[PDB]
Structure of RNA-dependent RNA polymerase 2:
Amino acid sequence: TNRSTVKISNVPQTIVADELLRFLELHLGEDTVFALARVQFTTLEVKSRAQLLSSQSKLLFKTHNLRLSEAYDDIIPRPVDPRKRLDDIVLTVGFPESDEKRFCALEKWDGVRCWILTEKRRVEFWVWESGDCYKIEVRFEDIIETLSCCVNGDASEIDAFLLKLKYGPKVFKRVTVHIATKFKSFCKEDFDFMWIRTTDFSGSKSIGTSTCFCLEVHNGSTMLDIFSGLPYYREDTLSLTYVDGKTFASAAQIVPLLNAAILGLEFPYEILFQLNALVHAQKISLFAASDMELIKILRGMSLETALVILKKLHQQSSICYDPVFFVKTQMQSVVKSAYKRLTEQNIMSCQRAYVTPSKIYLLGPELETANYVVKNFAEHVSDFMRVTFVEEDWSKLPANALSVNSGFVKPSRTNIYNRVLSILGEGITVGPKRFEFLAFSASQLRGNSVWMFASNEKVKAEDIREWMGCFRKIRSISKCAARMGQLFSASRQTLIVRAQDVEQIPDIEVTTDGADYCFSDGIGKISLAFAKQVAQKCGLSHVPSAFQIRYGGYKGVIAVDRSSFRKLSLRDSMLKFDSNNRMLNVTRWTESMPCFLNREIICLLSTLGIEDAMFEAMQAVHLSMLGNMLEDRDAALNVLQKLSGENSKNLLVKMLLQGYAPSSEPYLSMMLRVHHESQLSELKSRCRILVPKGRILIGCMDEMGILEYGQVYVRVTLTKAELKSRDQSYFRKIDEETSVVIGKVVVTKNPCLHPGDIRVLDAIYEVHFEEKGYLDCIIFPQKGERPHPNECSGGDLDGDQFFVSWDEKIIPSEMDPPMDYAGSRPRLMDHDVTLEEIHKFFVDYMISDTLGVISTAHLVHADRDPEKARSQKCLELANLHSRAVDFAKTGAPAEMPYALKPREFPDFLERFEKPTYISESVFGKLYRAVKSSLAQDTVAYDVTLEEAGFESFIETAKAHRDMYGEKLTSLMIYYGAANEEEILTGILKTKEMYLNRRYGDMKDRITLSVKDLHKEAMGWFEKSCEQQKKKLASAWYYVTYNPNHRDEKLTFLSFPWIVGDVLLDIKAENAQRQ
Ligand SMILES: [Mg+2]
């Protein structure tokens, strides 16, 4: 259980490893030590002797006794069991070749060293091909099936062991250190060198192509090993014969899992995009689809039937070894909106890919939200391809994989980085279509994902870059990335603006304290008429006070000024790039966003001097709200409406506002329980402890010079809770639904890492409120020593959302001096920017450590210091986070030093695979309070007679369930695993990747949204419309099918919910008569 490694107690600084072994000779057996305050022994049997002798205190060195402390991690991972460290055995890789018994031996390796580590979920194979020792770490979770095979004749039936893998292994390499090996405080088996993640070492590239591992164990008496530790072991044995897999060798490092060029004119959009996807998903083996018989059969029939049958094949769980038989069964005995829907529903049928470190995993055409480039190029939607780089497990690609990071002396990019660069340059070659790099978005860059486009005959892969307005005369990499990503972020197209309508005004600057500072970085002003026009254009009945635009090549948030008459009044400080597209791209406007704390904000507030036990009251209110949602109607407009982003448009809001209790309708109860679990998990992970007073407002300013330094104007549309109890010491009446904050206000940005970004400004009143009309927006001052948005980390008014809360409970008494926040030098290079440069920028971001790890390092280092956030390590982490944020402007990757690495994590963070310590120091009580809170009927008549009491008896709901309920079941079988019949962006219990949740939920959300819309489209098509005999009849039929016939083989509970708006409206109308 200790892996033969025991941590030592306090030791003298002049401890000698060599003398320790000689002393250990007089203390234990001969050569019983494996590595050398931690000491690792050769066997676990002598550990008990060592542990017992430690209590006797016999060992001593230089008048300082040494004790065996609690068990820690092994110095070098070797399995305690001698028989678990198999040595000098043979490994083969391939696929079962359509028969479960013919292993396609892609490559044979002899001398493989197998280490079946049991305490840690990992299986290690060491391959010494050529002169490099390349480790193969299978990992327990990867294994989908382990089998005892019979490679030889019937004698010695258990002669080989076969491991069916799904995600593929992690391949490493050994590099010389050329440094001293002792360093006082020491292995004995020459375990030098380090593991750098590397692409497949096989020339034929078998490891990528292969989906199974067969181990040729010398003896069959290894039943003790290869057991329930190795997942999915069935006692049934199978006789395995080897074949020749030389026809599957591929020398192209790109896409090492695709077929060959043995196809005449087969359509790739319906076969190659599906057959290869099936191979990657392991529904059919590579030979099962590369055989000429299946290819010819698939070419035989039309593309629609082929796509349907291949989708049905993908719906299967286990491997379909003989797809020819399946296709014959579903074709001979077949029993037998639009592609250009981007302009109508903005949903893409993207051919997303997952380029792992040593493989390719296409996920077929999955429906997702569209974007501007494909919105225009919808004629060639099948040609686009979203390529995401992952880590052989669909998780975030570690910075250790793409770079050595930390004694290294100089960062040397690993072979995975070169593979990423080559696969970006040469491109993905899926048959006839060869996908080339086009561009990426900012969030797309965060997602480790790239957009690729193939050189089509009508449109070339280079012409799209010409159309998008990038890579023509761009001088810096940062502005090239900004231009590439500006038109990819989700934005809606407003009205077109005249070129002469925009009227530039001088940028407001102060230039004090040495560093140059600009007050209005991205603050423009709209005329009232144009503001109204863009209000209808966006879809708002009122006039928002500020709009975050992307009009032209200039990005920023532009307010509404009733005094000015200029149409747009563009700013010169908005300098991003130059473009001729004079169309406003409004992304977000000013909402009264309900406020919610983050862990970094809590840490900074506690550091500044806010009582730690004072946040616990706000979380107590939060958990009182959360615990009374499955039993009380108070959740109707308190949890779903406020804590979750659901607005009044949600069906649950309708059916709770005027409907029954949370425990009445089983569908309502299940949805509210889903929300309960989601909110509890969020609060436990991300301490979104809602502050009732205060909001996250969009940073703006008033161009009229009244507001002074330390003064802010904040107007908020009061919530219902604040409307019921208004007129406090912090609010001042302005209208029936609005009030201006008068008390102290604390302001910080969303990251809020460095202690001092917390600026407790003064909220004041201006007589010119009717002159300006600023609403739901934080008005920063125009004059002063330093711009207030610059104080909040390195923020600026480019559309930033600034934290505000008026509670004296959490307001600091004092400020800490903020950082300089020096601007990023553009560094306009003469060499222009090429595709290779932006590819290098992408790979450099791959190397750069993400903001999440820096934030969690700051949090972990902030709980064990006399000063919570003012610690020196916290300051270095804050500066490094500033550098990482500025990386989008300066091509300098952010590598976190190993000194700031979190060696052990608190219990608030569920980092189970790491040392864990209780965090009773600083806001650690929040996690355990959340844990304590967490660890504490026929309705057919009501659904039908109270809303559609007329006897419909349409009975079309049975047919709908036969096609829409079956569709929901198929959609759930595609990705879901639980009984969530109406997921609606619900968090599935299974988390294969995690680390991707938004992308993973989007696949479930978009499919559920489309299916409900498809059911609504099916419902509308089946509806004959007055809609009394059609809509009410359909609602009543759905209610009868779901609620009255729940015992039937449907188990939907949500088919009436798709049309639930009509049912709820009818119930509300008929509440008078009942
Ligand atoms: Mg910004």
About this structure: The chain has 34 helices and 38 strands.
